[PDB]
Ligand binder design. Sequence first.
Ligand code: HEM
Ligand code: CA
Ligand code: K
Length: 267
Amino acid sequence: SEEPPFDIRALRADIEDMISEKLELGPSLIRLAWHEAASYDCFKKDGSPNSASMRFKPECLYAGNKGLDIPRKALETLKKKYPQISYADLWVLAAYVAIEYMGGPTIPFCWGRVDAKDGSVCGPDGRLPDGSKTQSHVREVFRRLGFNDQETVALIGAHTCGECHIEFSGYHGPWTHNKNGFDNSFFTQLLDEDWVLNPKVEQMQLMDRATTKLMMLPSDVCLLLDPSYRKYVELYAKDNDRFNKDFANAFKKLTELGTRNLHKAPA
Ligand code: HEM
Ligand SMILES: [Ca+2]
Ligand SMILES: [K+]
């Protein structure tokens, strides 16, 4: 529709380059964008999602955002090179490129997000979801964000890529045997393995009986235990195209929560 004031083409290319020079950045950029949107409360209408408010204290110090300085710092180099882009746009755009680069769907980008100017707009701590908890908590968090059960399950399928780091969350390991590819293999893994207790990680997590090299969180396996969430796990495990499409729509929605006057980018 409308040309952004920054060179989007060149920028897309710089972000693919940066990811290619450091592949484990792909998943952290997705998590960065998700956590900047995850402060929203659709009932209270607060929390400054999608405003790059995680640049500021105290949100940058919340336990759940630990390690997200890495992708923020990496993107600083690009903000410098393309000054017309807001950080908030940049953070969203880099997640979309990451998803695509790793084999995921191409999500239509909208631009024009305004950056928070100070940390007084940041939402409270305790809005990010807790991996040690299960379906009650999960549904409560995602209701509060504006998502239904179908959207919830689709979004959590992003765990198909990346991994847990002891230093950041206290959990350990990848969910899938290809942490650098974005497909429906998180649901597939969830359903096809026998998940057994990992007796050597201090924060409770499961491991696959077959190899013991994969992991799931309590919040992940709660998607099997809940009868509504399990319908959708099954839907995505048996239909990768459907997963691509629903993930695309839900993530776009996630990254457009609490925004206004966006413009559709070209491609
Ligand atoms: C129930 C909701 C969620 C919980 C409890 C949760 C929990 C976690 C935890 C504990 C980590 C590990 C962080 C680390 O140690 O580095 C993580 C990583 C990640 N999560 Fe989530 N997550 C949730 C939902 C989501 C959603 C909705 C998205 C995306 C749409 C997402 C995408 C990711 C990605 C990409 C990583 C990888 C980060 C990396 O490799 O550096 N997660 N998640
Ligand atoms: Ca925020
Ligand atoms: K994967």
